[PDB]
Assembly symmetry: D3
Homo-oligomer: 152 residues x 6
């Protein structure tokens, strides 16, 4: 079913440091998506290199990896219809300069190197990142009491 | 006069069920529109089983270009296209459960108001901030 | 059953005029109570003298009635366990001067003659106010999707 | 130092189900406490509390387990939750704002420092407790 | 008239630094009080309090304000919560936002006479703005 | 460095009268911009004529000046990367009819003559307006504790 699509959302160290964890989680809860998994950790450099491997030939990659390791992140899996694309809409443009008011980035940050949050860009990237950051024992299954009111 | 335009806004059963009535009314109040009428009822059958499935909040709101601006504030009818910052953009996912309905035109609005409300349920009063919302 | 207890809540003309209808309804929704009935009207002075009949000899009664007729009110019936007592706690003390931060009155008003809201003071008074303001066909029955998570 | 005290906070399945995870975390963040650990798991209140009364808990469901740090965070956390029985909780507290019945009181917090250390030992591995410094620490503490 | 009482409220550097100016102002506005004056300046808490142990803040930004309304001195104090955040209730500014008395983010006058003294000391008379709120008749009888 | 750009934001008399000062300041604070200057005043007509001199001969110029003088305003200077353009995005379109939900004007007002807020349209206008409304002693300097999490 399309309603079982999952995406990986990570609140970056600046999101934690500036006290935005609750605000972000609230936006996803109130949209109607279901929290599947969540943990709080300092990701190692090797872990972050595997996560950002597609960008290793980019000039900012050394900085990116350093900053993603400079504090703890909140790693999460969320489930719902088109949650990948829709979550990307909710985050706003990757460059906060282009993000619109009402989006997470549009409301809460300024510079691309401090854009507080990451979300999977595709279903395939989503499954790879979910597998990288979480094990199957860490995924929680339940039915939201409001399911029949969110979905037809 | 253009400032006395009215629109019909109905919160559907999924909006009542998920606890969104207060937020919706708040967005309309803080925009500067005036509540003209409101009632809470079960939608009788005159799809359409689904709107009887629960209660609806029927409302009439007044203000300049309130029909179109209301539609903007609701967001696109299909939540998949709704922008963050709109009611549907913030709170729902699927068109069959898009929690709210607003009139699409002035004539539609006056038809819906006649159909859902009696004329005496439409309350006339002046907002104490009217001179600060309108010139 | 104790969970089917109902109370009458009325947002007074100053609550409407100062744009607090949404905030108040939101507080009752998020507490877990079920909206049973709601309408918007300018109550007649006759109606208001019947509502406040117990205070007809008080010095402020004529002014109270006039002010309650000077604008529209939002009349509501809400349902839940100990909703009369608990709704009164949520409103704050009837005299805003003694209302606490976190309550409706404590957060939003100042003077007893402009205390923006009324709630039934007892189950008795609640049922007579419900009968005065609403017809039984105007009372809406449905089950909340979150009922099993609000009540054991 | 007293600023290094910790408490255990668990959002129960009714809190997850009614969409309150963000609100709760936000109240703790804005108070000034530091999130030390957090994970999402399935756990039953029934089985955790089955060895109890000696002579009506929620079944297995999703819970958010957390460890929070700060001065007097155990007691102040309990104040922020409000009374365990929502009927006695004051508006402005988590339970005062969001729930009605004690069997569905959406959240749990440790009632004493040693209880808190025990619960943290029970729920978390030592390596899940993350050490970092809040950028606002010097503005929360003198 | 008692409805013209005034109080002095100062947001301290920890309140500015933690991004709380808007929330605090919003609580006073929504309560129904009228903003009379406001300015943003650099001030040292030490030099001000040692001008007439908990370690006070050095020179930093403060938002100084004057608010008007019935019983605003006392009610303002209630809305701030107890001076020691350890005793502040949820729903108050200090109950919601801070932990330690030396970083209690805000100050309010403790009495009408204190309020008038501090208003004179921090503000010029022409900085006190007189206007009528459009909702005044719905806040006061 | 580009992160020190400053813009002039003014909350107009209708913004004060409808109780929006806190909401607006909150949106700027939570975005990551730094408050540099702020005061509360009734601007004189001649001050307002200087401020809007570029519009000195339009049909509405006389009305504008008289309304901007009809109540107090909150004048402010805010600092950050691209604060001029980004602040204009946050305000929404000058005409509320075109402002989008999530913007200040989109969320809070309706008509161009009552658009509750003003922001500098360019850096040059920003430097001119900041000098007109504030003297250098009124500009307050400090480093945000979160600077290193807002800027790379
Ligand atoms: C077609 C495109 C590629 C535009 C699709 O849109 P796309 O999303 O591919 O645009 P992107 O390739 O720029 O972004 C990819 C990633 O690279 C991150 N990143 C980008 N630029 C910088 C930078 N200067 N410093 C530090 N990090 C930077 C950026 O946040 C994003 O990571 P994350 O936020 O998703 O984790
Ligand atoms: C305590 O119980 P007790 O029976 O001793 O008196 P009460 O404090 O319950 O007030 C009962 C009602 O009277 C209203 N009212 C009271 N005083 C004034 C006043 N000076 N001016 C105008 N209205 C006033 C008051 O709001 C409340 O109505 P509501 O808030 O429920 O609509
Ligand atoms: C870009 C097109 O170029 P354009 O020439 O449209 O520039 P502008 O749209 O930015 O506005 C410049 C200023 O003009 C003000 N104003 C404009 N129209 C009216 C009006 N009917 N009645 C009263 N005031 C009006 C308007 O608020 C704005 O000032 P502020 O909002 O920044 O304070
Ligand atoms: Mg990045
Ligand atoms: Mg849209
Ligand atoms: Mg529709
Ligand atoms: Mg009495
Ligand atoms: Mg039903
Ligand atoms: Mg418990
Ligand atoms: Mg003090």
């Amino acid at each position: 079913m399309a309603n079982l699509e999952r995406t990986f959302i990570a609140i970056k160290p600046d999101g934690v440091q500036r006290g935005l964890v609750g605000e972000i989680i609230k936006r996803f809860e109130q949209k109607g998506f279901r929290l599947v998994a969540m943990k709080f950790l300092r990701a190692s450099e090797e872990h972050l290199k595997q996560h950002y491997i597609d960008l290793k030939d980019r000039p900012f990659f050394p900085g990116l990896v350093k900053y993603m390791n400079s504090g703890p992140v909140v790693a999460m899996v969320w489930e719902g219809l088109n949650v990948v694309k829709t979550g990307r809409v909710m985050l706003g443009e990757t460059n906060p300069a282009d993000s619109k008011p009402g989006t997470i980035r549009g409301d809460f940050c300024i510079q691309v190197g401090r854009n507080i949050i990451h979300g999977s860009d595709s279903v395939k990237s989503a499954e790879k990142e979910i597998s990288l950051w979480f094990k199957p024992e860490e995924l929680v299954d339940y039915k939201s009491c409001a399911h029949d009111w969110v979905y037809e």
